[PDB]
């Protein structure tokens, strides 16, 4: 699945318009045109060719469930406005000290906006 774009008809197939309220997968907007053939990367059984520098993520998706998630979960929203330097540092180090929540299918996807008073 790549979740392509229907170009003109996208306000229908937007996530919040199809009654999906959880943070959903994004849609790929610009389609890139390539030319010529594309070489084979695998074999008949589906195993990758030997040269082929592979990825580093797990072969299965990182669905981090209710027992694998870190305790004291960082908030989804953080805007660092009218907040002190110490509290801003505490919140930023919190969301940076929880790394695996940031890189997950059922991840956090935080919004880090604003700027504390020097």
């Amino acid at each position: 699945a790549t979740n392509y774009s229907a170009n003109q008809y996208e306000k229908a197939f937007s996530p919040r318009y199809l009654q999906n309220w959880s943070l959903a997968k994004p849609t790929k907007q610009r389609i890139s045109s390539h030319e010529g053939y594309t070489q084979i990367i695998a074999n008949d059984r589906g195993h990758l060719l030997p040269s082929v520098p592979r990825s580093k993520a797990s072969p299965w998706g990182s669905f981090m469930g209710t027992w694998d998630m870190p305790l004291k979960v960082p908030p989804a929203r953080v805007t660092l406005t009218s907040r002190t330097a110490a509290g801003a540092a505490s919140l930023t180090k919190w969301i940076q000290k929880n790394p695996n929540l940031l890189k997950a299918s059922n991840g956090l996807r935080p919004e880090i906006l604003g700027k504390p008073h020097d």
Partner: protein, 428 residues
């Protein structure tokens, strides 16, 4: 006697064709059985184009219904206009493509192309002048895209001058209906680009928008979709069936559209599509027909014309309208949207004004568009195809039918190439 042989293929084809003939027969009078129980003799002046009288005043449809396993055919015979067709014009088999282009263009297709070709020959050599042949099919899925493409190729070889309009439900963008759809399409287009004349492209996610956003139906059936494709398929062949000023046939539409050989994948669109409750807030006037026809929310193919340039638009208006209310709206819709029309071609819009409107509507209009934005469809199928071929996905069920990989590779190249022509002429 400009004539037409409607070759239907696969579920999509037979089903879409069933509704084509229902729509076409209602306008020409032909009844469930096949009798002209109609009025204005004009509905019988040019019935030769699509019907062949049979001793008894019965009009039989010139349609070779093809399929790889009598299934949609049973539904066709059970549906309203299902006895109109001649029992023998139904060439079927006993197997099924199983959404495999190979099992349709090589294995179970080869042992069923002679039968279809033999009916095409009896239905073509019995014509004073066969303008050409129509093919309702589905690029995504076997049979329609397998046996269908084989047929087009063969017909082409035998009759190389007659036209070959191909109405094709192209692999829709967002959701799919066949996993091997990328593969199927890439292969089928590699054949159409070099075997057809006017391939109209009818994605389904598009038609769904026209049903929920324009017509306003909170319960659409595949039937309503068929009718919309069956209306475009009707507009293109009105002047070869009824009188009218500035007449325009099929060869004309091509000549006055296809710029360079290949570039010929068009996007269709109807016009007076209105709501059962909004027909009290609108106004059937040529001005409005122009706007609806040139809005990238009516086109029956997800390819926002706006992300591109129109190399040639075609507008077949059916109705009694004022040439200067039509000729003008064309100039304005071209001089007030210059960025979306090629400047290396003056007047990028042809214009037919027939004089018999679709029963029930005062004025109508079909819209054939040769946009450069059609690249998006081919570029999406190429990306989806490269994601699979790269890792021999669902390919044993193709190389196990005989298809060598050279074939598959070639397909991508031809498609990837065509993907350039469109951008070369989309940017001077």
């Amino acid at each position: 006697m400009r004539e037409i042989v409607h070759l239907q293929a696969g579920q999509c084809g037979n089903q879409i064709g069933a509704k084509f003939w229902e729509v076409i027969s209602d306008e020409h009078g032909i009844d469930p059985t096949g009798t002209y129980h109609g009025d204005s003799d004009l509905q019988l002046e040019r019935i030769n184009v699509y019907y062949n009288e049979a001793t008894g005043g019965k009009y039989v449809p010139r349609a070779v219904l093809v399929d790889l396993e009598p299934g949609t055919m049973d539904s066709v015979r059970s549906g309203p206009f299902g006895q109109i067709f001649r029992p023998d014009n139904f060439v079927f088999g006993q197997s099924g493509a199983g959404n495999n282009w190979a099992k349709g263009h090589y294995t179970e297709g080869a042992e069923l192309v002679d039968s279809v070709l033999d009916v095409v020959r009896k239905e073509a050599e019995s014509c004073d002048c066969l303008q050409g042949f129509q093919l309702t099919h589905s690029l995504g899925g076997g049979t329609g895209s397998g046996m269908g493409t084989l047929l087009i190729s063969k017909i082409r070889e035998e009759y190389p001058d007659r036209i070959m309009n191909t109405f094709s439900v192209v692999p829709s963008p967002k959701v799919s209906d066949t996993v091997v759809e990328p593969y199927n399409a890439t292969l089928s287009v590699h054949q159409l680009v070099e075997n057809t004349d006017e391939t109209y492209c009818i994605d389904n996610e598009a038609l769904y928008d026209i049903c929920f956003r324009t017509l306003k139906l909170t319960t659409p059936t595949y039937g309503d979709l068929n009718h919309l494709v069956s209306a475009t398929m009707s507009g293109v062949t009105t002047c070869l069936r009824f009188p009218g000023q500035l007449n325009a046939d099929l060869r004309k539409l091509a000549v006055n559209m296809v710029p360079f050989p290949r570039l010929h994948f068009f996007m269709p669109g109807f016009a007076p599509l209105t709501s059962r409750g909004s027909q009290q807030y609108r106004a059937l006037t040529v001005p409005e027909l122009t706007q609806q026809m040139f809005d990238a929310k009516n086109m029956m193919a997800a390819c926002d014309p706006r992300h591109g340039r129109y190399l040639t638009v075609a507008a077949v208006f059916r109705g009694r309208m004022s040439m200067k209310e039509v000729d003008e709206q064309m100039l304005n819709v071209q001089n007030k949207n210059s960025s979306y029309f090629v400047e290396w071609i003056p007047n990028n819009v042809k214009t037919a004004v027939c004089d018999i409107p679709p029963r029930g509507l005062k004025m109508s209009a079909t819209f054939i568009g040769n946009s450069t934005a059609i690249q998006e469809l081919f570029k999406r199928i190429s990306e989806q195809f490269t994601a699979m071929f790269r890792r021999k996905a669902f390919l044993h069920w193709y190389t196990g039918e005989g298809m060598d990989e050279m074939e598959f590779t070639e397909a991508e190249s031809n498609m990837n190439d065509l993907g350039n022509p469109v951008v070369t002429r989309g940017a001077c």
